[PDB]
Nucleic acid binder design. Structure first.
Length: 84
RNA sequence: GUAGU
């Protein structure tokens, strides 16, 4: 599982991602790659599902939209989470 | 308003 989420609004948050992505399955993780000085979302983030069956639905649907902006969700390039 | 560990 795990997906990159492009085309977001500058008003989108990772709680707002969970609010939209909870329609396809329970999310295991959500992120928005925002600037900490200007609070701009950069127009993108990430979401992980508790099962692949939520990833399957997000790929199978032809269009997505959050805060009146067309979003572009896709399979995430592999990475390793760091402990803290 | 589009690539993170």
């Amino acid at each position: 599982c795990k997906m990159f989420i492009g085309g977001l609004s500058w008003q989108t948050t990772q709680e707002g991602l969970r609010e939209y992505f909870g329609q396809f399955g329970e999310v295991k993780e959500c992120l928005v790659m925002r600037d900490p000085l200007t609070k701009r979302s950069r127009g993108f983030g990430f979401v992980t599902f508790m099962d692949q069956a939520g990833v399957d639905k997000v790929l199978a649907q032809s269009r997505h939209e959050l805060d009146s902006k067309t979003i572009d969700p896709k399979v995430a390039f592999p990475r390793r989470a760091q402990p803290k």
